[PDB]
């Protein structure tokens, strides 16, 4: 499971098992990676060229 071969988790207390899907998430925060890069550079140029 730690090698990302079989996807699933067990139950030690009751001896049960659970269902675990492969994808853990979607692509959302990735779109913010481009916005944070422009606001940490261009914005610095906005104040310097104006002053």
């Amino acid at each position: 499971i730690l090698d990302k071969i079989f996807y699933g988790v067990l139950d030690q207390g009751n001896g049960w098992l659970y269902v675990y899907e492969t994808p853990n998430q979607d692509a959302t925060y990735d779109s913010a990676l481009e916005l944070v890069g422009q606001l940490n550079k261009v914005v610095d140029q906005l104040f310097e060229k104006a002053s």
Partner: protein, 284 residues
């Protein structure tokens, strides 16, 4: 003086459709109406004419066919005097009709109000709807009734007038082309209810409901991938100039992805909020 033709919404669509078959092929039709000279001019209804071996010509007018139509056009009261003819030709810079030259001279003897209309585009219309007519002045435009008192006349400045090949004399004897369209009370409400920009009606409750929320099968499907498309469009152009100077030689690059992804997002939000906004009352 001259005559200002006033084609309504009914006559313009009929005279055009008759000449929309083929680029090289030429056809002809007959115009009917009741008016008086001294400006004003109307057209009631039109119908196409059969094509002879000469195509468009003066001998192509069938007096047998024309007499039978005027009897069949009397049932609805649209039968009137002959106000002219309309033809179909590919069009040129001057003398759009490749055959008719002096044929109007024989038309002026029958009716002095008769004109010859030629449709230049032949399904080339870009929305301007430019049609050409003709009237024989014969000897005139010197010490006589003054035509250019009405609208858009005395043209020919330098070498550029209309098509720019006609300049002053236009086709023959400076016929002083004047064309205007009008809409009556019935033509106003009918056209706006049929064709204005695009006709979505009759679906009005499903108009934007079926085209969007019910079309979600594949339209916006996988919105998470649709948002990924807006990411690649922005990341491409935003990467160009981060220094606010001249590097990659561009100007509107930051505004290219701005307007494209703005209308897409505006459509993504309106469709999504109206999914449950219709309120079909599902309950349980």
């Amino acid at each position: 003086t001259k005559e200002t033709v006033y084609i309504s919404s009914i006559a313009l669509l009929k005279m055009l459709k008759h000449g929309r078959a083929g680029v090289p092929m030429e056809v002809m039709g007959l115009m009917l109406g009741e008016f008086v000279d001294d400006y004003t001019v109307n057209v009631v209804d039109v119908f196409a004419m059969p094509q002879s071996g000469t195509g468009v010509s003066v001998e192509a007018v069938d007096d047998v066919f024309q007499a039978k139509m005027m009897d069949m056009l009397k049932q609805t009261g649209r039968d009137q005097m002959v106000v002219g003819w309309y033809h179909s030709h590919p069009g040129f810079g001057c003398w759009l009709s490749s055959v008719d030259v002096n044929t109007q001279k024989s038309f002026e003897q029958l009716n002095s109000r008769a004109v010859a209309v030629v449709v230049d585009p032949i399904q080339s219309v870009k929305g301007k709807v430019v049609i050409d007519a003709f009237r024989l002045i014969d000897t005139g435009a010197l010490i006589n009734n003054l035509e250019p008192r009405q609208t858009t006349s005395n043209t020919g400045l330098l070498n550029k007038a209309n098509i720019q090949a006609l300049i002053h004399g236009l086709n023959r004897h400076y016929y002083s082309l004047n064309i205007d369209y009008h809409k009556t009370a019935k033509e106003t409400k009918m056209l706006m209810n049929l064709h204005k920009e695009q006709w979505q009606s009759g679906l009005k409750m499903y108009d934007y409901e079926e085209k969007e929320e019910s079309n979600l099968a594949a339209t916006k499907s996988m919105v998470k991938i649709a948002e990924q498309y807006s990411k690649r469009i922005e990341e491409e152009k935003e990467l160009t100039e981060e220094e606010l100077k001249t590097r990659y030689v561009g100007r509107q690059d930051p505004k290219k992805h701005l307007s494209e992804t703005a209308d897409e997002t505006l459509e993504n939000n309106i469709v999504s909020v109206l999914t449950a906004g219709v309120n079909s009352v599902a309950i349980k």
